[PDB]
């Protein structure tokens, strides 16, 4: 008895219905309320300057053409009928390649409340477009936007909203971080207006705020360069007569800084300016360069070729520029570390 | 109200033919085009192309769709576009392109009372370039986008940039990570063939490559390794292991820089301008250890059969030679 009335309601919905045109095309603006549930904020590619996110994307809008009367108050349609009802063309302004899933059935729900207010809760996967300012690599933070609006319809035709308080509408799942590089602090929900060539559009916005973890770069990139510079300054406490030892030392510490430089620049998008890591590596490379130049200035003033014996003709003294550089270079490197780590942990 | 609008759409699309050109026997239809570039995603020097996301919009006045009695512009659902006429426009530079499909497929049909119809498409296309990478990384590229009608000739269809020099917008929004856009030009022309003259448009760019990054990564350490090669000149000839360790560890470091810039840079197997600079620096570092071979064979070999002359001469010759090399390089390419 109930299924008979149900199939009669299903048959007599779409009689005289037209899915080509907006509900109230001359009457009112069509208010569409929107809810988002992020199940995973997937992995953020720095080379492509993009990110991946998975959402359940709930919509709701009142359609006068789909009132009904029956036993129940709420319906649940096929996608065969959800392709036969007007549905607002919500595209994503920064989408690169996005997928509406259909395993196993198409992931589309359409509820009809008995007043005619639809509820259309589909499940997506969004490969978005977050432009990154990388002056402060890797000690930086930036916002990544998720921005949707209607495509064909203007502000005069379709106006979007949120289903709740706006900061509570976009809900990230608790186990839905799914990042290794960055660290999601929180979202910021907003609403805005574009001026395209075709008219003003209501454009929603969710920002996602991301700070990069820096422990990997302190272990891999910063500390080996620091210890290499510490070695290049250390060599001064070898004696002035051991020319091949300090020579091999200086040139191969420059080779070590070369290896660290190229391996640190490899794992990074090829931006066209000076990242903070590039400043650090270049100045450390300059220190290891200046150490070997200082040893050359030591070697030019040697006058002798043999070592001081362990018991006592003349001998060499420790050169004065050795005693100068032993105080000079670690002080300059410590001053540069204070300036660097005080400048770039502040922004 | 709404019933009149529904009856109006039903009688506009009553008996419509989706194969007739507008004014099928009369004049050619004018299609005015319009692009809002969202972004340029990647510029791949390996694959010689670029990925271009835009809003490709068209205008043509179709007198089979002119309504009356309604003041508002009829913006229909995008699924009426399978029931209309559209131009057969394609992209000559294209490799692989797609109208986006989330959440529904991105079209718009915005009708007008005289019969003008807007046709919008959010297209992420991939357009090819022929790249002159012989001056890499000091090049200026010229990447285009070539739009052409497919079946209709210019007797049937006409393409113009709607607005002259201000059709294509949003190029100033583009912030490429390694390029910098000098200039975009807009070209409209009919292309004479043997089969018939076809219309063509041409969006184009110019991409000046940004060069301070390679000063950071690639040029500066080769310069400093080249200068550290010279340190053997201010060492006594008796210290053999020091000058040999200098020259040998220096050519080893140049080998590592050349190999990991063979691996780091985009891989395009012909002669570039960073390759000439790195190989020239490798030649200078090689000559600066041929110098020690020259010194050791003259003193310790041709002794019984000057050293400060050769060293004092090389200390003046090699910086002048390397500065002349930098002069020739950075004025011949720039």
């Amino acid at each position, epitope marked *: 008895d109930n299924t008979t009335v149900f199939t009669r309601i299903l048959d007599r919905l779409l009689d005289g219905y037209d899915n080509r045109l907006r509900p109230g095309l001359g009457e009112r603006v069509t208010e569409v309320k929107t809810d988002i549930f992020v199940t995973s904020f997937g992995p953020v590619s720095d080379h492509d300057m993009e990110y991946t996110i998975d959402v359940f994307f709930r919509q709701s809008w009142k359609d006068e053409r789909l009132k009904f009367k029956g036993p129940m108050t709420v319906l649940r349609l096929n996608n065969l009928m959800a392709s036969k009802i007007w549905t607002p063309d919500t595209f994503f302004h920064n989408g690169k390649k996005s997928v509406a899933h259909n395993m196993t059935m198409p992931n589309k729900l359409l509820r009809i409340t008995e007043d005619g207010t639809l509820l259309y809760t589909m499940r997506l996967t969004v490969r978005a477009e977050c*432009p990154m*300012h990388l002056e402060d690599f890797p000690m930086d933070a930036h916002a990544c*936007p998720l921005k949707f609006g209607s495509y064909a319809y203007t502000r005069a035709e379709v106006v979007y909203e949120w289903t709740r308080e706006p900061a509570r509408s976009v809900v990230v799942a608790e186990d839905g971080s799914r990042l290794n590089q960055y660290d999601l*602090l929180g979202q910021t929900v907003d609403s*805005g207006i*574009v001026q395209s060539s075709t008219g003003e559009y209501v454009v929603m*916005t969710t*920002h996602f*705020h991301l700070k990069r973890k820096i422990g990997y770069f302190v272990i891999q990139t910063y500390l080996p360069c620091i210890m290499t510079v510490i070695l290049s300054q250390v060599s001064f406490w070898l004696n002035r007569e051991s020319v091949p030892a300090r020579t091999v030392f200086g040139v191969t510490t420059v080779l070590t800084m070369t290896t660290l430089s190229i391996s640190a620049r490899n794992s990074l998008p090829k931006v066209a300016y000076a990242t903070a890591m590039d400043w650090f590596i270049a100045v450390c490379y300059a220190f290891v360069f200046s150490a070997l130049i200082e040893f050359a200035t030591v070697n030019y003033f040697t006058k002798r070729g043999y070592a001081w014996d362990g018991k006592s003709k003349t001998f060499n003294s420790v050169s004065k520029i050795d005693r100068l550089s032993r105080i000079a270079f670690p002080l300059l490197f410590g001053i540069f570390n204070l300036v660097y780590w005080a400048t770039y942990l502040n922004r | 109200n709404m019933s009149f609008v529904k009856e109006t759409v039903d009688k506009l699309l009553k008996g419509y033919d989706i194969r007739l050109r507008p004014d099928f026997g009369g004049p050619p239809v004018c299609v005015g085009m319009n692009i809002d570039i969202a972004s340029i995603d990647m510029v791949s020097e390996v694959n010689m192309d670029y990925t271009l996301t835009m809003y490709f919009q068209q205008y043509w006045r179709d007198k089979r769709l002119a309504y009356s009695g309604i003041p508002l512009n009829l913006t229909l659902d995008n699924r009426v576009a399978d029931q209309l006429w559209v131009p057969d426009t394609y992209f000559l530079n294209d490799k692989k392109s797609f109208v986006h499909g989330v959440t529904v497929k991105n079209r718009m049909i915005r009708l007008h009372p005289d019969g003008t119809v807007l046709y919008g498409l959010r297209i992420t296309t991939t357009a090819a370039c022929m790249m002159d990478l012989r001056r890499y990384p000091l090049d200026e590229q010229n990447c285009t986008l070539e739009i052409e009608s497919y079946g209709y000739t210019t007797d049937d269809i006409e393409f113009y940039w709607r607005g002259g020099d201000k059709a294509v917008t949003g190029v100033e*929004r583009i912030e490429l990570p390694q390029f910098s856009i000098v200039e975009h030009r807009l070209v409209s022309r009919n292309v004479v063939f043997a089969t018939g003259a076809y219309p063509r448009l041409s969006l184009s760019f110019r991409l000046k490559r940004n060069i301070g990054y390679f000063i950071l990564q690639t040029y500066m350490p080769s310069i400093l390794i080249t200068i550290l090669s010279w340190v053997s000149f201010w060492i006594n000839y008796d210290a053999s292991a020091a000058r040999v360790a200098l020259g040998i560890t220096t050519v080893l470091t140049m080998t590592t820089i050349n190999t990991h810039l063979r691996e780091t840079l985009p891989k395009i197997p012909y002669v570039k301008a960073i390759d000439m600079y790195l190989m020239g620096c490798f030649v200078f570092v090689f000559l600066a250890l041929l110098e020690y071979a020259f010194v050791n064979y003259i003193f310790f070999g041709r002794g019984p059969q000057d050293v400060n002359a050769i060293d004092r001469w090389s200390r003046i010759v090699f910086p002048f030679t390397f500065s002349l090399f930098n002069l020739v390089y950075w004025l011949y390419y720039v």
Partner: nanobody
Amino acid sequence: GSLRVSCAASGRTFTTYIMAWFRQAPGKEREFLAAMDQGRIQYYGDSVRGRFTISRDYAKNSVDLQLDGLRPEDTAVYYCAAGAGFWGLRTASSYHYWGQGTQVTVSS
């Protein structure tokens, strides 16, 4: 009446940066007015929504606030701002570049 207040920039290409206008009455309160994104999106303050209009010239690197229908209570200093707003678009601790501030005095 009407007013048009611009804000030129130099030293940096701000094409990718969210530029804004603020307002500070005597009372030490930096109120958000308007902001245009890199993707041309106008965000507006809540108290001033629909009255004013923000626009940018992305080539000449400037932001332009068009003033419209001025109350006498629109009497304050107008602060140009730029940034890449982090916990942003409404909060003064997101913008890291600032204008010199311009007094606008309106009475009846």
